[PDB]
């Protein structure tokens, strides 16, 4: 039994990263570059209607992630409480995250699923929920997240990096992350 | 700015570890006994004592009595303490735990320790470990250490700056309590505290607990109704630095 056990991140691909957008462009673009340098293929969506958001994300949930390390999904800036805003409706986050629970999504079983909600609980093994809260240059949270990904994304254990974000932001609003991760999570460079 | 910044733990004292342990309840609450909870209590007491805490246990307090002890504790000086730990072993659901006779909202308990209301813990880690869920009537499929299994019911919420909220189980999963040996969560937490508490960063350690617990399986021929009801623990961190419990 090894206390240093890490998620195996040696799949052909790092995986998909979804950005749903609802100043806020700076956030989106900054997240895009950061996740790309981390290997992620990034898909962005703008002001989707609920029928269309559900359609898309379900599409994504049902393709094979067999050859991927993990999955990232970002909602900025939707979400009061346990909901997120589409164009025409609020949607329970659990309804979206649920598509990725081991039951409903076999190829991500054992792999980390990361959800980042920025404000205007869901659960599953190997989930990591990041909440921004419990400007033309962006928002405090995303700016700092991207600054940390930039300098440390490739080396620090991910939840340590999120703690950094907690600290940078709380020195200016207290963000938080909830972990159901079962191992250390690193994004060392691939191939 | 330092990626490896740690909470300063060089205070005179480690701090207080509170344990609120609840085995039985008032009849009108309609809750079952929590057999095995005293094993949890005792195991935690040894582990946290090893790590330097003055541990104060309380058994089956009524809500008012409990509110009073928690309040008394939040109003003494903590200036020469590294941190604070509180544990609830009781029933609960949504946003509340149960004392002996009544529900108490969690946000009321943590609230007592938020920077406004509690100055001497500002910037210090406040750690809540919650092993709670609502016992129901179990259908027993057949015809002494029994494994009891219930659905997660307590919302796994965050609490404020420098709080770390640790939950035995997350939504959609199941809590397990062995009538003799105690909770899967508390057992595994104490085993990890035992082997690594004085070496490993606390959140790393809690990750280990997530793994040991979520790997546990009931044995079918001993507890047929309980598998496979997976248990997934969860922690919410609003910590701002690395947390260690090195010997003082």
Curated annotation (Swiss-Prot), chain A:
* Gene Ontology biological process terms from the UniProt entry: activation of innate immune response; apoptotic process; cellular response to staurosporine; epithelial cell differentiation; hepatocyte apoptotic process; intrinsic apoptotic signaling pathway by p53 class mediator; positive regulation of apoptotic process; positive regulation of necroptotic process
Q: What is this protein called?
A: Caspase-6
One GO cellular component assignment for this chain's record is:
nucleoplasm
- SMART domains tied to this protein: CASc
Recorded catalytic activity of this chain's protein: Strict requirement for Asp at position P1 and has a preferred cleavage sequence of Val-Glu-His-Asp-|-
One of the record's GO molecular function terms: identical protein binding
UniProt effect for mutating residue 176 to S: Reduced palmitoylation, leading to increased cysteine protease activity
Family according to the record:
Belongs to the peptidase C14A family.
- InterPro entries assigned to the protein according to its UniProt record, in alphabetical order: Caspase-like_dom_sf (IPR029030), Caspase_cys_AS (IPR033139), Caspase_his_AS (IPR016129), Pept_C14 (IPR002398), Pept_C14_caspase (IPR011600), Pept_C14_p10 (IPR002138), Pept_C14_p20 (IPR001309), Pept_C14A (IPR015917)
Disulfide pairs here are none
Q: What is the effect of changing residue 170 to E?
A: Phospho-mimetic mutant; loss of self-activation
Phosphoserine PTM sites in chain numbering: 36, 170
Q: Where is the lipid attached (S-palmitoyl cysteine)?
A: 176
Q: How are the domains described in the entry? A: The N-terminal disordered prodomain is required to prevent self-activation. The Tri-arginine exosite is required to recruit substrates for hydrolysis.
Role summary: Cysteine protease that plays essential roles in programmed cell death, axonal degeneration, development and innate immunity. Acts as a non-canonical executioner caspase during apoptosis: localizes in the nucleus and cleaves the nuclear structural protein NUMA1 and lamin A/LMNA thereby inducing nuclear shrinkage and fragmentation. Lamin-A/LMNA cleavage is required for chromatin condensation and nuclear disassembly during apoptotic execution. (Microbial infection) Proteolytically cleaves the N protein of coronaviruses such as MERS-CoV and SARS-CoV. The cleavage of MERS-CoV N-protein leads to two fragments and modulates coronavirus replication by regulating IFN signaling. The two fragments produced by the cleavage interact with IRF3 inhibiting its nuclear translocation after activation and reduce the expression of IFNB and IFN-stimulated genes. The same mechanism seems to be used by other coronaviruses such as SARS-CoV and SARS-CoV-2 to enhance their replication.
UniProtKB/Swiss-Prot annotation, chain B:
Impact reported for residue 214 to D = Phospho-mimetic mutant; prevents caspase-6 autoactivation
UniProt note: domains: The N-terminal disordered prodomain is required to prevent self-activation.
**Belongs to which family?**
Belongs to the peptidase C14A family.
In the Enzyme Commission scheme, what number(s) does this protein have?
Answer: 3.4.22.59
Effect caused by changing residue 221 to S: Reduced palmitoylation, leading to increased cysteine protease activity
This chain belongs to the protein called Caspase-6
Source organism (scientific name): Homo sapiens
Chemical reaction(s) catalysed: Strict requirement for Asp at position P1 and has a preferred cleavage sequence of Val-Glu-His-Asp-|-
Q: Region 130's region: start and end of each range?
A: 95-112
- GO molecular-function terms, A-Z: cysteine-type endopeptidase activity; cysteine-type peptidase activity; identical protein binding
